[PDB]
Design an enzyme around this catalytic site. Structure first.
Site, PDB file in Angstrom:
ATOM      1  N   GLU A 232       6.206  -0.718  17.084  1.00 39.98           N
ATOM      2  CA  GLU A 232       5.244  -1.588  16.415  1.00 39.98           C
ATOM      3  C   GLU A 232       5.774  -3.009  16.436  1.00 39.98           C
ATOM      4  O   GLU A 232       5.001  -3.965  16.557  1.00 39.98           O
ATOM      5  CB  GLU A 232       4.962  -1.105  14.977  1.00 39.98           C
ATOM      6  CG  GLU A 232       4.084  -2.041  14.182  1.00 39.98           C
ATOM      7  CD  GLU A 232       3.864  -1.602  12.744  1.00 39.98           C
ATOM      8  OE1 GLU A 232       3.571  -2.487  11.889  1.00 39.98           O
ATOM      9  OE2 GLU A 232       3.970  -0.374  12.479  1.00 39.98           O
ATOM     10  N   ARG A 310       4.776  -0.288   0.120  1.00 48.02           N
ATOM     11  CA  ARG A 310       4.175   1.037   0.218  1.00 48.02           C
ATOM     12  C   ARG A 310       4.938   2.087  -0.601  1.00 48.02           C
ATOM     13  O   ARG A 310       4.314   2.990  -1.199  1.00 48.02           O
ATOM     14  CB  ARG A 310       3.940   1.485   1.665  1.00 48.02           C
ATOM     15  CG  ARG A 310       3.368   2.896   1.785  1.00 48.02           C
ATOM     16  CD  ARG A 310       2.936   3.241   3.210  1.00 48.02           C
ATOM     17  NE  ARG A 310       1.764   2.461   3.596  1.00 48.02           N
ATOM     18  CZ  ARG A 310       0.494   2.819   3.368  1.00 48.02           C
ATOM     19  NH1 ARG A 310       0.197   3.963   2.768  1.00 48.02           N
ATOM     20  NH2 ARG A 310      -0.478   2.021   3.777  1.00 48.02           N
ATOM     21  N   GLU A 691      -0.238   9.605   9.440  1.00 45.16           N
ATOM     22  CA  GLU A 691       0.914   9.588   8.550  1.00 45.16           C
ATOM     23  C   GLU A 691       0.861  10.484   7.295  1.00 45.16           C
ATOM     24  O   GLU A 691       1.903  10.984   6.884  1.00 45.16           O
ATOM     25  CB  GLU A 691       1.153   8.182   8.071  1.00 45.16           C
ATOM     26  CG  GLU A 691       1.537   7.199   9.129  1.00 45.16           C
ATOM     27  CD  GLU A 691       1.468   5.795   8.587  1.00 45.16           C
ATOM     28  OE1 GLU A 691       0.364   5.365   8.202  1.00 45.16           O
ATOM     29  OE2 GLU A 691       2.517   5.138   8.499  1.00 45.16           O
TER      30      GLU A 691
HETATM   31  N1  LIG Z   1       1.297  11.943  19.382  1.00 45.75           N
HETATM   32  C1  LIG Z   1       1.495  11.018  18.431  1.00 45.75           C
HETATM   33  N2  LIG Z   1       0.953  11.141  17.177  1.00 45.75           N
HETATM   34  C2  LIG Z   1       1.166  10.178  16.248  1.00 45.75           C
HETATM   35  C3  LIG Z   1       2.039   9.010  16.581  1.00 45.75           C
HETATM   36  C4  LIG Z   1       2.586   8.978  17.962  1.00 45.75           C
HETATM   37  O1  LIG Z   1       3.335   8.053  18.380  1.00 45.75           O
HETATM   38  N3  LIG Z   1       2.268   9.988  18.788  1.00 45.75           N
HETATM   39  N4  LIG Z   1       2.275   8.048  15.624  1.00 45.75           N
HETATM   40  C5  LIG Z   1       1.899   8.336  14.241  1.00 45.75           C
HETATM   41  C6  LIG Z   1       1.847   7.081  13.427  1.00 45.75           C
HETATM   42  S1  LIG Z   1       3.343   6.423  13.002  1.00 45.75           S
HETATM   43  C7  LIG Z   1       0.689   6.465  13.109  1.00 45.75           C
HETATM   44  S2  LIG Z   1       0.683   5.060  12.146  1.00 45.75           S
HETATM   45  C8  LIG Z   1      -0.633   6.988  13.626  1.00 45.75           C
HETATM   46  C9  LIG Z   1      -1.382   5.752  14.126  1.00 45.75           C
HETATM   47  O2  LIG Z   1      -2.477   5.964  14.998  1.00 45.75           O
HETATM   48  P1  LIG Z   1      -3.961   6.241  14.352  1.00 45.75           P
HETATM   49  O3  LIG Z   1      -4.196   5.004  13.503  1.00 45.75           O
HETATM   50  O4  LIG Z   1      -4.864   6.291  15.538  1.00 45.75           O
HETATM   51  O5  LIG Z   1      -3.633   7.509  13.647  1.00 45.75           O
HETATM   52  O6  LIG Z   1      -0.442   8.018  14.625  1.00 45.75           O
HETATM   53  C10 LIG Z   1       0.545   8.998  14.209  1.00 45.75           C
HETATM   54  N5  LIG Z   1       0.631  10.216  15.024  1.00 45.75           N
END
Ligand SMILES: Nc1nc2c(c(=O)[nH]1)N[C@H]1C(S)=C(S)[C@@H](COP(=O)(O)O)O[C@H]1N2
Ligand SMILES: Cc1cc2nc3c(=O)[nH]c(=O)nc-3n(C[C@H](O)[C@H](O)[C@H](O)COP(=O)(O)OP(=O)(O)OC[C@H]3O[C@@H](n4cnc5c(N)ncnc54)[C@H](O)[C@@H]3O)c2cc1C
Ligand SMILES: Cc1cc2nc3c(=O)[nH]c(=O)nc-3n(C[C@H](O)[C@H](O)[C@H](O)COP(=O)(O)OP(=O)(O)OC[C@H]3O[C@@H](n4cnc5c(N)ncnc54)[C@H](O)[C@@H]3O)c2cc1C
Ligand code: FES
Ligand code: FES
Ligand code: FES
Ligand code: FES
Lengths: 745, 164, 305, 149, 50, 164, 305
Positions: A232, A310, A691
């Protein structure tokens, strides 16, 4: 119309055949060079000399890069408190001093190892306890306070105080950081292919380093092999290095980090230290709570403040506490700067809440489920930050999880196992979570899209969101198909790029589906309005025909879409205004079996019930719940980073850092999405899922703690209402040491 | 005055006339032969992203033997007269997917997809040795493969369909 | 098959086709590095920045891959893959009487949550032994059982049981400059002979502070009176070590509660770690050395009483 | 069609359907956007023409490119100006850079399409009526030569 | 405001230094191949074989 | 058993150990040395887009001699001990433009720009032989250079400023 | 300087350092192609798909670059660049009496709107001559003036004035398989000797149908009575040709209107083209052979009367 249908990830077949392209899979240009970072081996020192004579002898050596080759600015990072390259002093072991450029990655590696640096050591601060003692913090104390704490504590029957620690976490995305930078040789123009969740800041930081306007820099992201928060902001450590080598040589340059560099350099999840004091009644009801949090931020600010915000927002978990005081400090230390990791301070603060909540129940001699359920928020309640909980669905998840897991019947069988076994014990715990949805910095809650309809009726979608495995592009295609009323086979998402959607927020905070969903939806409404006249002229014609008639009447088939999340703006003075658009809720029950002689344990069963509104894609959402939960079990039970007393990371690959394996997961593993709970606040009644479920992995931690309690009753004390400190991660070392017996003595 | 190294990749002959002893099979697949399905995840044998299959006639056993290996740690100079099979060797969306590739894709066993070729190649290797494995053989085939996205359950549910 | 020669920027590689070639090459170039699976050498060259300008690969040599069934036990050429050792020992365990496979089952237990199939398919037995990692899961078992090592150079041939003296210092073995490990004979279990093998399920440093052990007891015929006792430990020093002072004291004692307590006190003292011993986990490691012995103690009783 | 992005540093990126072939279309487009936006030409850039930024473009032809893309760019600039107007009022003596940053922080989109459609065209070969051209360009040349007979 | 002013072509200085990129000036990928058209030598004919 | 070809391009030594007799200097600059300022316009000597300057010590005349050549027709095997100068050898926007480059640019002598390096190199060559040329020398310098965009007037008007 | 050898996929190039090397090489390999500037060969290899497996480059040889001023005229080595020839002739023209530079000025006229500086800097003199293109602007002038050619092989040396017999058929000259053109002597003009050169300002085919000419008259001392007359044309046949039949008839005639008409009639007949002669432009080319002679006819009168 596939919204609400279990449609597989659009790229999944190509990922299975190895046809999907990740950054380092892009073919090299004939003249493309390779970069390797030169990195500090001291936690805090003055740089006395850098010697490159032996590196210059490596075949293929092109050049060494340092702060003095930078044309624009060596000042970088989110708060301008980092360097691109360290000049006078290094301030952590991962600290980037320079970079070698060579003709192959093997030569770049050889040349970099042979770069000799000379140091004079300075006083280093490494642990949170070092930082508290030295008053080494970024900024000042953060605080949320509601009610009357003197008075709440006066009214309380019992008061438990304590200290708690929770270690950090390495992201361990299978694809490490990677950048290709292509210099055009005209007007400072550069094109970058990046494994990043933040194309905008990449673009800015590169432009800043080069002393060149942002319009010259094009950043492109097709997909990441995982991100989890780790890309990020921290991606720019590699990106800017590689942009520099590109600028200086005039050739294309790339770099992909080897695992061991990535782990040392790019930062991870914030370690938390908590000191807490809770006041409660003999019944279990909470009357007062005081928590001071301390995060190990490392050697720059980065996202540390927002993470601590948070954490203060989540120190309640799902419990109504009338008198509450939470504070947080960020510890300035000589470690790699820590960053976003799935949960963004949430899991830390939720772990601290469930800990003192576990101790409330043991002190009261009450069953844990009972103490939690009785302290639980109700529909319409305000939080410690004064936000009304509308559509609070934890009670439904709770009762549904109890039913499906058959909690009460398995509680009996756990107690039967413990009565009948001496050196093995079972544990059982049911745990709730709530997770607030939005960026806490309100201005990040904006999203753009760009849609083109071509004359064959095919549609190209672009939005600010990046794909990192979570199936964002899949969900966006589902949304556009529903909005446009055409098959998904007509719509395509190629990539994310700063020349199609400018100024995009990082793909983060679980809100991407929400915000880009809306921006895409809006762009599709614009198309539909423009095509409406032709649709009337030819009501029984096809999409193709309406699009061609629109082209030939010179109606634009291209539009932007934009969304701005309404009604957000929390104030830390006043303690009012909405921090989150809404909350995602869930409940997990887990059973484990510990080997009290080894500290080893089995994950026997986990039941999850998550409130994800009306899921846009059940299959993707269930996969996010499972994936998140396993990352949490890693956090709480398995993953442990370890440093030397001099602040040097020892655990730098899969042999020394254990993320969950195929054989780590619960033998019986059940996830259900809650039925009939549409969310008014998000696209097609869905909820954010990325998350929120990660913290539910703590059900394994507290099931382990229950089992340790039973081993302690067997071999250590007769005191039921005993409290003992168990830090996270509860690894075999910690589990075994807590099972005090004839051997530990 | 150096010997030629001769091996096979995906049914195709590779003659290397200037083999460097330090060259891993991973580097060779990706940067020499341009086959980028096989991935770097760690370079220390822990993660399996670089898993490939290897085949040789065993001069002892009789037999052609099939086994998985980490491409990141395999020196090319060990592979003289060895046949390498990578993810692109077994199927594609251009032609046809192998049942292994299809089932991991449809079962939602692939999120970011970075571990998938390695996992596909472990399963493939299992099946090439035992066309009818048990459920137990199937879970134990993957001790060498890590996935950070899925929590593993969908992968094993997908591959479980090969058992009995 | 004929000897092959590869030449790089820094390294010369010889693929030996024959034992005689290997021993001639080794005597001409005593500093030459044997590489079989490269699962350790590759780590050493990449991460610990070692360079071995001359490498010999003996993987083709028939002697170094031979699996033999003798009167004393099963012998394995030093280049046999861990998967092959495991397959052979699984087949032996299924076929033989339980009483003869105590060590084999100890080997297999250490191999259970070892690396994945990809590593075990190329990692060699001899390579693990000569690596001589303080946290090797195999060298404790081989030490405890007195596994017999055949060690050859040009002219010289000698067989020795593995004992404490085989690992003199960190990462070092008792081979000469010109010697190679030919084969390893994993012994059959005798009557009144019992064996266990245990391990810490997790290392935290690359090659220290992970507790792993091999434990053997031999009783006088039909009794519970100790005749031989071997308790060997990885993860407790910079090498695999034997608790000799402790076990020597238990010779001709009986397998009872009093023995349990005497061994634990011997262990706690003989294997004591300083508070800042490399690798930390000082309490846990101590507790494991005692808890593992307790596990062995109770398992032996069940195999008897 | 046209697409314009203002980045947070105040730097502008212009894309329109026209291609550059030496005739100075991009130069002229940058001049038009500088005028419409009221910022120096050094703040605006045109990189390239591409089908993922501007779809369905007509060929760069008929001498009309300056005319039609000039208009589309102009229109996209008017949209940016309207969106930036509130922040210009809040800070009348600030700079372009500050108005743009204030716009970003209030979550105003700094990205827009622009589109132009030539009015009143449609000639019929039956009826012999309806305008064929928007207007005519005119000129006159005088030449003198000497021949070798 | 430069409208109506004799501003030189924006790329004219980079064209003069050979820095301006035209299509064949873009660098080749390592695996990049080259094509050549096969063309008719007859104005009107049936193709009998290639 | 072949000789080495040694020449110079923009002040820099080029040692070619396997020179092919059929290799034109144009091909070599663009596709070997990656200097793409020199252009292909026709490959038959008529358009001058590929104009470069050549320099050698003349074993007869005494002297270092400077002259323009068409890189499309110059075999590299004629250039042993010859110094090549292309457009990137005289100036750049990264560093500083030569007066020739600046004046063609500011004078509106460049539209599409594809002829410009060639015309720059013809003018440069003229100036390197005759630092103060006549107007007549200047117009006659370009009989080898074609431009399809400008109608030529601006280019001569701009270079006219070097005269007298 | 030493002989260099380059070897490609199809071609072997030899850079000769010395006349001796050149002649030895040329006798050993009579099929070898001399390349100097490559402005013809490069076109032949690229566009006409010729392959010459063996090439000799004689550009380094001092004899082939020698500029000499003798009593008869100016000699140029066959490897001299057209720009050097032009510079020398311009210098000669500025220095000598007009009466001695009639040919030099005709050479210079043909060079005026020839190629650009880039071509003239590398295109050699001997290269243009031995190319023997039907439309060469130089071979007519050389033929008309009787320019002397030195032609050498191993052992053999011979000087010949260029005449009609030098270009026997298409693209062919009167050199043996083993011979090279060494030098070329462009003659001084004599008293009562006058010269002109003209050319079509435009070709339409690559090597035919472009009219180009060299015209010489030598009068009896102080008179207008023709002693010698040479009219040489390119673009009128598949080779440079001389109107010998026409000019032979004018020997010892007077430069008057009657001669004008007689020559035009001779030309129209002797140089007549068939309606479908290669290259077309039949009427125009005819008209130019006569109009060019008229231009010569008038210019001669002005140099006299
Ligand atoms: N396969 C996969 N799932 C994941 C992630 C990822 O890097 N890969 N990141 C997570 C995180 S840290 C976040 S903030 C969310 C963000 O994407 P979204 O807003 O589309 O959920 O995906 C989540 N699930
Ligand atoms: C992912 C992974 C997990 C692992 N887990 C474990 C574990 O849990 N427990 C454990 O104990 N080990 C573990 N290992 C270590 C592994 O088992 C050894 O690295 C392997 O057996 C070494 O064999 P090799 O054939 O790869 O040897 P190589 O790397 O080729 O060589 C190893 C050493 O032995 C020498 N050598 C090889 N053969 C001979 C010969 N016969 N005579 C004399 N010297 C010789 C070489 O010179 C070299 O120094 C693990 C390794 C990996 C990569
Ligand atoms: C675009 C351009 C414009 C031109 N315009 C004209 C024009 O207007 N009028 C005109 O007449 N010509 C014109 N030419 C032709 C030009 O004059 C010839 O190409 C040039 O003079 C040939 O010389 P070279 O050194 O490049 O020969 P090369 O290409 O090196 O060789 C030419 C031929 O002569 C042979 N040769 C060279 N030297 C000797 C030697 N000493 N002994 C024996 N054989 C030898 C070679 O073997 C080859 O067959 C033009 C050419 C170009 C490139
Ligand atoms: S890259 Fe991780 S095992 Fe090979
Ligand atoms: S799908 Fe991302 S690592 Fe497995
Ligand atoms: S490309 Fe036209 S002269 Fe060389
Ligand atoms: S500017 Fe276009 S060809 Fe000269």
């Amino acid at each position: 119309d596939t919204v609400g249908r279990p449609l597989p990830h659009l790229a999944a077949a190509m990922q299975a055949s190895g046809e999907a392209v990740y950054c380092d899979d892009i073919p090299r240009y004939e003249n493309e060079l390779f970069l390797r970072l030169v990195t500090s081996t001291r936690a805090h020192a003055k740089i006395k000399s850098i010697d490159v004579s032996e590196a210059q002898k490596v075949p293929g050596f092109v050049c060494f890069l340092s702060a003095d080759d930078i044309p624009g600015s060596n000042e970088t990072g989110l708060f301008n408190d980092e360097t691109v390259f360290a000049k006078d002093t290094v301030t952590c072991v991962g600290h980037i001093i320079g970079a070698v450029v060579a003709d192959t990655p093997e030569h770049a590696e050889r040349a970099a190892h042979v770069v000799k640096v000379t140091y004079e050591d300075l006083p280093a601060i490494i642990t949170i306890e070092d930082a508290i003692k030295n008053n080494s913090f970024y900024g000042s104390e953060l605080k949320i306070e509601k009610g009357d704490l003197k008075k709440g504590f006066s009214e309380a029957d019992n008061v438990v105080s304590g200290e708690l620690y929770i270690g950090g976490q390495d992201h361990f995305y299978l694809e490490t950081h990677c950048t290709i930078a292509i210099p055009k040789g005209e007007e400072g123009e550069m094109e970058l292919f990046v494994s990043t969740q933040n194309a905008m800041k990449t673009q800015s930081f590169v432009a800043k380093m080069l002393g060149v306007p942002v319009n010259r820099i094009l950043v492109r992201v097709k997909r990441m092999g995982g991100g989890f928060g780790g890309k990020e902001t921290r991606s720019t450590l590699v990106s800017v290095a590689v942009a520099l080598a590109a600028y200086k040589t005039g050739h294309p340059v790339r770099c992909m980090l080897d695992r061991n560099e990535d782990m040392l350099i790019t930062g991870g999840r914030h370690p938390f230290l908590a000191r807490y004091k809770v006041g409660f009644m003999k019944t279990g009801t909470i009357v007062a709570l005081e928590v001071d949090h301390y995060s190990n931020a490392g050697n720059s600010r980065d996202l540390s403040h927002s993470i601590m915000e948070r954490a203060l927002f989540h120190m309640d978990n799902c419990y109504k506490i009338p008198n509450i005081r939470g504070t947080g400090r960020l510890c300035k230390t000589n470690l790699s700067s820590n960053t976003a990791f799935r949960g963004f301070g949430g899991p830390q603060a939720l772990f601290i809440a469930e800990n003192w909540m576990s101790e409330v129940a043991v002190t009261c001699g009450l069953p844990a489920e009972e103490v939690r359920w009785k302290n639980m928020y109700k529909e319409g309640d305000l939080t410690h930050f004064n936000q009304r909980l509308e559509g609070f669905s934890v009670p439904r998840c709770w009762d549904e999880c109890l039913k499906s897991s058959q909690y009460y019947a398995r509680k009996s069988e756990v107690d039967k196992f413990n009565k009948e076994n001496c050196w093995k014990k079972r544990g059982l715990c049911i745990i709730p979570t709530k997770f607030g949805i939005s960026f806490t910095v309100p201005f990040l809650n904006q999203a753009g899209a760009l849609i083109h309809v071509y004359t064959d009726g095919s549609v190209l979608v672009s939005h600010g969101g990046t794909e990192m495995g979570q199936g964002l592009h899949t969900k966006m295609v589902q949304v556009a198909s529903k909005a446009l009323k055409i098959p998904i086979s007509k719509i395509y998402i190629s990539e994310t790029s700063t020349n199609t959607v400018p100024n995009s927020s990082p793909t983060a905070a679980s809100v991407s589906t929400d915000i880009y969903g809306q921006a895409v939806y809006e762009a599709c409404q614009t198309i539909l309005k423009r095509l409406e006249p032709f649709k009337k002229k030819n009501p029984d014609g096809s999409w193709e025909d309406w699009v061609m008639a629109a082209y030939q009447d010179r109606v634009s088939l291209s539009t932007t879409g934009f969304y701005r999340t309404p009604n957000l703006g929390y104030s830390f003075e006043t303690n009012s205004g909405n921090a989150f658009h809404y909350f995602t809720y869930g409940v997990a029950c887990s059973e484990v079996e510990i080997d009290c002689l080894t500290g080893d344990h089995k994950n026997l069963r986990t039941d999850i019930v998550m409130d994800v509104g009306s899921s846009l894609n059940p299959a993707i959402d269930i996969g996010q719940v499972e994936g998140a939960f396993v990352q949490g079990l890693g956090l709480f039970t398995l993953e442990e980073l370890h440093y030397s007393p001099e602040g040097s990371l020892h655990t730098r690959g899969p042999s020394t850092y254990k993320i969950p394996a195929f054989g780590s997961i619960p033998t019986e593993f059940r996830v259900s999405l809650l039925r009939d709970c549409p969310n008014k606040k998000a696209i097609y009644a869905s909820k954010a899922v990325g998350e929120p479920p990660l913290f539910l992995g703590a059900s394994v931690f507290f099931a382990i703690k229950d089992a340790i309690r039973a081993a302690r009753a067997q071999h250590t004390n007769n005191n039921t209402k005993e409290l003992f400190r168990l830090d996270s991660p509860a690894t075999p070392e910690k589990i075994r040491n807590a099972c005090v017996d004839k051997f530990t003595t | 005055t150096a010997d030629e190294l001769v091996f096979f990749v995906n049914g195709k002959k590779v003659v290397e006339k200037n083999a460097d002893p330090e060259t891993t099979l991973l580097a060779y697949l990706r940067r020499k032969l341009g086959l980028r399905g096989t991935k770097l995840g760690c370079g220390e044998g822990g993660c399996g992203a670089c898993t490939v299959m290897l085949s040789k006639y065993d001069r002892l056993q009789d037999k052609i033997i099939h086994f998985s290996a980490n491409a990141c740690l395999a020196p090319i100079c060990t592979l003289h007269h060895v046949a390498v099979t990578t993810v692109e060797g077994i199927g594609s969306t251009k032609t046809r997917l192998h049942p292994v590739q299809e089932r991991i894709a449809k079962s939602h066993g692939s999120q970011c997809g970075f571990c998938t070729p390695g996992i596909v190649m472990s399963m493939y290797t299992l099946l090439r040795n035992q066309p009818e494995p048990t459920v137990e053989e199937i879970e134990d085939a993957f001790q060498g493969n890590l996935c950070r996205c899925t929590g593993y359950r969908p992968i094993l549910q997908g591959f479980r369909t090969f058992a009995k | 098959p004929k000897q092959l020669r590869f030449e790089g920027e820094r390294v010369t590689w010889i693929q030996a086709s024959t034992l005689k070639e290997l021993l001639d090459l080794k005597a001409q170039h005593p500093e030459a590095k044997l590489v079989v699976g490269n699962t350790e050498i590759g780590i050493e060259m990449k991460f610990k920045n070692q360079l071995f300008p001359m490498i010999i690969c003996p993987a083709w040599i028939p002697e170094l891959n031979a699996v033999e069934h003798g009167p004393e036990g099963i012998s394995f050429g030093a280049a046999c893959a861990l998967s092959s050792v495991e397959k052979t020992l699984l087949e032996a365990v299924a076929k033989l009487p339980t009483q003869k496979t105590e060590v084999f089952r100890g080997v297999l237990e250490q191999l259970r949550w070892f690396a994945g199939k990809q590593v075990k398919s190329v990692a060699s037995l001899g390579g693990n032994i000569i690596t001589a990692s303080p946290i090797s899961d195999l060298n404790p078992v081989f030490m405890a059982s007195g596994t017999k090592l055949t060690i050859v150079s040009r002219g010289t041939r000698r067989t020795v049981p593995m004992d404490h003296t085989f690992f003199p210092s960190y990462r070092k073995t008792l081979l000469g400059p010109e010697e190679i490990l030919l084969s390893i004979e994993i012994p059959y279990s005798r009557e009144d002979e019992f064996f266990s093998a245990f391990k810490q399920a997790s290392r935290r440093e690359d090659d220290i502070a992970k507790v792993t052990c091999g434990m053997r007891v031999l009783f006088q015929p039909g009794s519970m009176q100790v005749k031989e006792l071997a308790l060997c430990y990885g993860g407790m020093a910079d090498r695999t070590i034997s608790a000799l002072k402790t076990t020597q004291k238990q010779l001709s004692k009986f397998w009872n509660e009093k023995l349990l307590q005497d061994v634990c006190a011997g262990l706690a003292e003989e294997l004591s770690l300083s508070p800042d011993a490399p690798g930390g986990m000082i309490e846990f490691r101590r507790t494991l050395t005692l808890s593992f012995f307790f596990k062995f103690y109770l398992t032996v009783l069940k195999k008897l009483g």
